[PDB]
Symmetry: none
Subunit: 270 residues, 6 copies
């Protein structure tokens, strides 16, 4: 990784942004390789304050990626995620699965439509059923396509476990336990009703935001439980009953792309 034999920070930040590198060690290493055929990368290794620049650069790119994701409307955002979708699947892969899980495409399309706008009480789609019915399967594939984030209720003892809600456009709380559902009930009523929540971030002061769209998976039916009365009118549920087990379903990013490109009209994304 030859490191030896006037530096503009702009040019570097640019390069990092273009390549979507946000992480210092990557930025550092990757720019050092570019220096074979890049004058500014060559000038960088001549600098004494490399470590400072690598840091700054990460901070710079982290600022931009974060703030452009926030700036785009939900349609433009989905549009962006469609462009990122490589390979080729089909929206049919998705329909086939719902058919298998005996749920209405139409029900889903509506739910999703309103979930995407983050309309109050329509902001949270639960995917409920016993183990191995492809709940994780579908939800994670959707989050992936969407550029979402997974929240782990394991980390709930720290209140920072919600930090990413100040960032994503969609979020998934995987495998909800009772603990977790009543957590929702206790603390997050406002996330469901589209009122503001103070989300604490680690190295800087907390921010007040509207909680982005939420997915949940669970073995637990909230609508069928009395102790979660508040949740009934705020959580849209879908039950999966059907096994997915061979030593058959794998929704891809292109599957979702086709799904959105094709039902774009029906999802009110115009």
């Amino acid at each position: 990784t030859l490191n030896e034999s006037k530096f503009d920070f702009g040019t570097m930040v640019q390069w990092a942004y273009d390549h979507k590198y946000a992480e210092e060690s990557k930025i550092a290493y990757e720019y050092a390789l570019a220096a074979g055929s890049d004058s500014n990368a060559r000038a960088f290794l001549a600098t004494n304050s490399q470590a400072k620049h690598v840091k700054d650069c990460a901070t710079m790119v982290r600022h931009y990626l974060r703030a452009e994701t926030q700036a785009l409307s939900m349609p433009a955002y989905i549009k962006a995620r469609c462009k990122l979708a490589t390979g080729e699947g089909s929206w049919k892969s998705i329909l086939t699965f719902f058919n298998y899980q005996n749920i209405e495409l139409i029900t889903f399309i509506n739910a999703l439509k309103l979930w995407l706008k983050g309309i109050p009480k329509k902001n949270c789609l639960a995917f409920i059923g016993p183990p191995n019915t492809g709940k994780s399967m579908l939800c994670n594939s959707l989050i992936h396509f969407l550029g979402g984030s997974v929240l782990s209720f394991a980390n709930h003892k720290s209140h920072f476990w919600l930090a990413s809600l100040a960032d994503t456009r969609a979020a998934l709380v995987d495998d909800a336990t009772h603990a977790c559902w009543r957590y929702f009930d206790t603390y997050l009523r406002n996330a469901l009703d589209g009122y503001p929540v103070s989300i604490d971030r680690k190295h800087k002061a907390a921010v007040q935001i509207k909680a982005p769209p939420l997915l949940v998976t669970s073995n637990i039916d909230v609508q069928a439980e009395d102790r979660y009365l508040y949740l009934h009118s705020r959580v849209q549920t879908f039950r999966f009953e059907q096994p997915c087990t061979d030593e058959p379903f794998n929704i891809t990013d292109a599957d979702w792309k086709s799904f959105f490109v094709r039902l774009w009209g029906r999802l009110d994304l115009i």
Copy 2:
């Protein structure tokens, strides 16, 4: 975007202040956009210390914004908030709602007049009743109009969860559970009173300040509960009993313009004069 290519800090701050951009990412990104037709934004992308300038800009803006909000009296402040609101509105929306909850508007007016002045033991209004009675609805609309902040009891194990009290002119805790009331009872009587309190802020120094007016929504009626005895005298309760939804429509929705109408109409009786 284009992030690439002498800089004056003040100008960037001027900019950020004008656009009321206070938050680092927005400041950096939004300015990087201004780069196309602003030589200062172009120069910003030429320096090696952009990260720091963004950082300092946010500090500077926050300083100014806080400072100007604290300087204003309640009247002058509400005045500026009225100036900010837009759209079609009427105080009748508010009247209708209180009337729907079988509460005379004057009862609320009397309470609000004192609450706004932050008079001791009158510094806290709680809206209380069964689910879906428009409690969060009303309180949030008001807090929004006032530019107040929401406190999130989910963050209460942190020292800094109260940090906003050093800045806003009104504050809301939405859906106070039993754990929540107890915390308030044990640790926060005098803030509920609107007495001076030491508010700890993250990176900065603790600040001693008059606790701003408080709003609470809750399913728990503190006045009826013997175990919250000591909260009875410092919390004025409004009981919302009537449903504000079937899950067909939601008929009651108060806008900023409704409050603008409200304060303008009732400027006199809320003693917000000279």
Copy 3:
């Protein structure tokens, strides 16, 4: 506000000190205003380092302010506090109120005389009774007159919640609940006693310092409670039984101290 447009730091500090502006936001903003008719304020908005100047200014002003407060004897200090108060006032307001609570003013004068000197086991006065008996009312007015600080037990899980004790000449804990009394009993007897106490400051290192005089208000009568046995000796209790609202101003206290100067041993 205008934020755009050779800078001298000292002049900015001078300014900040003069106006008693000690906090960064206020300093920054208020100085940016002075910019219309102040070349140094103008020059401040021209520098690319204004962020740290505001920071340093705040630091510098609190250094001075703290240092000048600490330097004054209690008499000299109260003197300056009297100078500061304005408006119409009378110690009678205070007499009336203690009389209303069926307490002779002299009982309070005696206790206060010692409390001000920060005499061990006498460093803490507690105002105790059922709700709405003007406990917080009185204590807060006094703390205000004195320029003392409020302690917020709510922050007690932090290391720095006592940090003001390194600066003020008097402190108040308003509405001590059982949890509050217990914490004090367990951890802070010496603080109550007004003995030297190690006080953790946020970014600076700790200081060993004598703890200022203390005021507490509470519904809990510590004197009557066997489980707060060890607090009985270090806390003088004033029972406020009568309800009410009535108000004590700074000018009332000014009148109070001026009138009772000699009787308070303030030489």
Copy 4:
């Protein structure tokens, strides 16, 4: 040592990288030595900001080294672990150990092959048996060879215990207690199934990642206990029955193992 007397930082970093020194103290010391014969090292000692340069050099090196290893394929990584490990080595060492515990070698090779590929349900090999059957012995030896990390699940207090997973190519859970298995059962199905998990770290932001391959050692046979029904298809148990008190597996043993069985572990690059 001499620490007395124009400096180019990159040159130092270059040097440090070459000798694989990621260690402030080591860096500082070694440079100050390589200095009566390096114009730059001399120049370094002339500078007043030496302390800063050492700190930066470390940072810079640990960046490069970390980033260069993160970028390898699993096969390429093992090839690196093979270069890195030297000594008296034979795989005969391991084969007899398996033969002693009555596990067929091929059962293990296969399992490892699919494990190194982090295929879901093939992502977590448990080694199970009563105290003192060389479970730690073997797993530590392997994880060491591979440069993976060791995790201890205490109880509640273990909040950040997974923090290393954010970074290693492989990991070992040392003596899974029953509660540790319940933790998997409750919170880790996604990790085992190939899905992202949020991993909380100390004084930095949480990360989301695919869980590295896991080794577990326990006295608790999860295949037997129905209260862990959901792990049965996700965890592959190797049972160690025989007590051992001599056997000892080394970096050099694993090297020989991997080189010998390379084609059979499907590492073809």
Copy 5:
């Protein structure tokens, strides 16, 4: 005050050292005062980096002061402390008090002699009894005379609550509650014995240092309690039973005390 208007750092440090000003706020303020008749203090208010200078000055003075204190043996140190004390004083004040508590002064002298040497298992003296028996009174007067530090168990949840142990020659814990005694029992046996301990300091590296001689006042009799068994051996207890407040030991009293009992306290 005036803070407005070539600066030598060393001179400010010299000044600060001379006046024993160790505290940023005091250093800043007190120097800004010296500005009327000191060209260096004037120059200080001309620099734009005065904030850093105040900070570095305190650091610097702290360095020197610490280093001086650490260099001296116990005798030489007490010597310096005696030199510092002023006023009318008599060891008889101390004698009378111990006699009032029905304790022979020699009992205290014997214990104090060893305590001062920081001999293992003898490094901790505890003054114990019902309220208002002059416990805090006495221990505080001594800790003051010695220039020792108070530890505040209130801050024990912090890593640096023991940071002063890297600097002072004697330390006091005033009113040890049950929570206090337990913490000591669990975590600080070695510190009570006066063995080395790793002391965490704010902007500095940890130092391993002999925990200095300890004083404790308390209402709790550790020797009588079975659950504080492991403290019995490392804690010498003086029981103060008789009520007092009048009784008031000054620095000059201690000066008299050490001067009189120099040989008898073995201070060669």
Copy 6:
């Protein structure tokens, strides 16, 4: 002291290293005194950044010292530790003490031989008994002689408490309680096995090192307790039952160990 009226930092570091001053307090003060003769020390006192220079100097020094110390073999190290120990002393007092506790010195020697090489399951020696049996004093004298560190379970809630396992050649946990033994049982297993573990820092670097030979003193007998079964084979226990409750109590010193090590150098397999 005098701290008043170009500077070269390397020169200050040279001085500090030679004099082996690694604490800022000392570096600061001592260099200030050396200003009369040495005129770099003079330059130092004329800089406005004196404070930083001290800070950086301490850093720089302790870097070097840590680095030479790791480079040494255990043999060569103990040698330097003997070279460092001063005063009159004898190994007899070590013999006297074990014999007092009814233990053959050779039981101790054997253990120590293996413990110094850091052999798996021999890496930790424990001295276990009722209060007042010479446990702490024996261990401390050894650790002191060895230049090792004393870990404080007080700060255990922050992993940073093991930071010094990165630097020192031997460590002592004085007076282990149940809480502390449980800690070993879950975390420090690998330490008792020769397999490297990850040590953290306040100045976050996050290294991995083989764990130094450990000493523990305790009123708790681990071999007697099942909740500590793992530790049985990995902790070598020396039971001290005889009390020393009767001006200056018994005392082992650096010189006592110095001779102990010079005399028993052979038998301890320290040969090279």
